[PDB]
Amino acid sequence: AFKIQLDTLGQLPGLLSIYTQISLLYPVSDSSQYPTIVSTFEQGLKRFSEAVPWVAGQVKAEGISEGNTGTSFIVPFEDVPRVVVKDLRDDPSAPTIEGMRKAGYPMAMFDENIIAPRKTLPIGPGTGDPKPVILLQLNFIKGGLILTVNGQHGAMDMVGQDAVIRLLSKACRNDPFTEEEMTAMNLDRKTIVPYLENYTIGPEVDHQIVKADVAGGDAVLTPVSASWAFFTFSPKAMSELKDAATKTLDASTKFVSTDDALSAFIWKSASRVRLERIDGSAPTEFCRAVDARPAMGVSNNYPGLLQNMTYHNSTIGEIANESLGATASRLRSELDPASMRQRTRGLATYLHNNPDKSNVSLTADADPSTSVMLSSWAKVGLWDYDFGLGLGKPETVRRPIFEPVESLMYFMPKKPDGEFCAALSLRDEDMDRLKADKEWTKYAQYVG
């Protein structure tokens, strides 16, 4: 038995309600291999659960009442995490490995309804019902295997989910866990962010509390037609964007990263096409997800939810028209560790002080029409894991498609050669213009 209070940050209503999904594709040479794939995975899940029982638990809330959104804990559920095994080899609506390869692994070929064990959003059957900490699905497709992992978002951010998956891979291989891994997996969560003393409200929580007169909130489904698409950026395209940004930096900015440069290029490209439907004076906010473990001095192997955002406010015309380096400098300027730490402590403290957490959101004031809400998974280690399956490393690592959430965006785990894959969700008007935009298509290959 275990009763592990979630990270205070994981008590955010918008995180408690969603699952983060990721899919790994492997080629499978012969259908004779599938029974061993399954048994290897089941034995790995069993070994993992024996070492760290909470990975098989569920997230459960208690103390909910009027004006009290309660407190959630990881508590026992089943003996092992649930894996669903699904044979799609003869399903004509399923993808095939050759179809994938020919289309360049599009998001539309990773349909969460077909290849994931549970939806991202709390929509449909069984989303009212236990919330398992992690759920898995093995999908047999013609010539291949799609492994999908779902993580309960209050229990883990993608850095934490990567930590968990990485240890699952070790458990499948029957490789020992290190002492540091075991320690990180068992750190107390409710104390991992030290609170601020005598804190009511401050700039730490700017852009994170919903107000009646300000548009924003969690996973806003806009009443406009929208879609998801992947765009790939070659290692050369990425280095040319980084070069272009580096040449045009603000005087206050010594350097920017590859990630900064692409995030900036997208904000600029989005703002540029949006000029076709709104005035340049229209405000625009970039909300950028940031792993807060380094600022807090926490192990990269901590499997919980320790993430914040940085916020950047300008206007559509300014962002579109300024240099790439000006825009990348905006982003880099908010990454001082001391700042991230103070802001993160402030958010955690505000949450701790307030039984009613219903107004708190990482995108509290991000207007979907003009904003960019981006989370980069570029640094996570998913391209390296083989799960003892004998299939080699993943051929691709892609997020499943789900309902369009206007202005929400992700970077996939960076391919070892340096290729980036960006998932963009935009209203049709914006998406169509972006795809036809020469400055965009110079670097971005549309995949879908």
Ligand X SMILES: CC1=C[C@@H]2O[C@@H]3[C@H](O)C[C@](C)([C@@]2(CO)[C@H](O)C1=O)[C@]31CO1
Q: Which residues of the chain form contacts with ligand COA (CB under 6 A)?
A: 157-159, 242, 255, 257-260, 289-291, 307, 335, 375-376, 379
Token pair, residue 24, equals 């790994």
* Spatial contact of 35 and 145, defined as CB atoms under 8 Å apart: no
Q: Does 61 bind ligand X (CB under 6 A)?
A: no
412-431 mask for Mg ion (x: CB under 5 A)? --------------------
Q: Does 68 bind Mg ion (CB under 5 A)?
A: no
CA 234 vs CA 241, 328, 401, 423: distances in Å = 11, 19, 22, 15
Q: How are strands ordered across the β-sheet holding 396-398?
A: 82-87, 134-141, 144-152, 19-27, 396-398
Q: Does 363 bind ligand X (CB under 6 A)?
A: yes
Q: Which is nearer to ligand X, 380 or 431 (CB)?
A: 380
CA 109 vs CA 77, 112, 115, 276, 365: distances in Å = 32, 9, 9, 31, 33
**What phi and psi, each to the nearest 5 degrees, are found at residue 364?**
-55, -35
If contact means CB under 5 to 8 A according to the sort of partner, which of Na ion, Mg ion, ligand COA, none does residue 290 touch?
ligand COA
Distance CA 55, CA 164 (A): 8
For ligand X, which residue of 4, 9, 16, 18 counts as binding (CB under 6 A)? 18
If contact means CB under 5 to 8 A according to the sort of partner, which of Na ion, ligand COA, ligand X, none does residue 159 touch?
ligand COA
- Strands in 160-237 per DSSP E: 226-233
Choose among 90, 25, 65: nearest CA to 394. 25
If contact means CB under 5 to 8 A according to the sort of partner, which of ligand COA, ligand X, Na ion, none does residue 16 touch?
none
If contact means CB under 5 to 8 A according to the sort of partner, which of ligand COA, ligand X, Na ion, none does residue 178 touch?
Na ion
- Give the interface size with Mg ion as a residue count (CB under 5 A): 2
**What phi and psi, each to the nearest 5 degrees, are found at residue 432?**
-60, -45
CA angle 16, 21, 25 (to 5 degrees): 165
Q: Does 191 bind Mg ion (CB under 5 A)?
A: no
Token pair, residue 397, equals 């690592």
We find the least distance from the C-beta atom of residue 55 to ligand X, in angstroms, to be: 20
Task: For residue 247, count other CB atoms closer than 10 A to its CB.
Answer: 10
Q: Which is nearer to Mg ion, 248 or 359 (CB)?
A: 359
Task: For residue 84, count other CB atoms closer than 10 A to its CB.
Answer: 13
Distance CA 308, CA 344 (A): 7
Amino acid at 369: S
We find the least distance from the C-beta atom of residue 35 to Mg ion, in angstroms, to be: 51
If contact means CB under 5 to 8 A according to the sort of partner, which of ligand COA, Mg ion, Na ion, none does residue 307 touch?
ligand COA
Q: Which is nearer to ligand X, 307 or 349 (CB)?
A: 307
Q: Which is nearer to ligand X, 311 or 440 (CB)?
A: 311
SS3 content of the chain, % helix, strand, coil (to 5): 35, 25, 45
Distance CA 302, CA 147 (A): 23
Distance CA 412, CA 396 (A): 10
Choose among 14, 10, 356, 9: nearest CA to 219. 14
We find the least distance from the C-beta atom of residue 439 to ligand X, in angstroms, to be: 25
Choose among 283, 279, 242, 248: nearest CA to 263. 242
Q: Which is nearer to Mg ion, 222 or 359 (CB)?
A: 359
Q: Which is nearer to ligand COA, 95 or 151 (CB)?
A: 151
Q: Which is nearer to Mg ion, 333 or 359 (CB)?
A: 359
270-309 mask for ligand X (x: CB under 6 A)? -------------------x--------------------
For ligand X, which residue of 61, 182, 210, 219 counts as binding (CB under 6 A)? 219
We find the least distance from the C-beta atom of residue 219 to ligand X, in angstroms, to be: 3
For 39, the 3-state DSSP assignment is helix
Q: Which is nearer to ligand COA, 284 or 376 (CB)?
A: 376
The number of residues in the chain equals 448
Q: Which is nearer to ligand COA, 158 or 444 (CB)?
A: 158
Q: Which is nearer to ligand X, 387 or 410 (CB)?
A: 410
Close Cβ partners of 79 (under 8 Å, ≥ 6 residues apart): 46, 49, 56
If contact means CB under 5 to 8 A according to the sort of partner, which of ligand COA, ligand X, Na ion, none does residue 362 touch?
ligand X
Q: What residues from 348 to 377 belong to the interface with Mg ion (CB under 5 A)?
A: 358-359
The region of 13-21, 251-259, 393-401, 430-438 touching ligand X under the rule CB under 6 A is: 13-21
Q: Does 133 bind ligand X (CB under 6 A)?
A: no
Instruction: Name the site residues for Mg ion (rule: CB under 5 A).
Output: 358-359
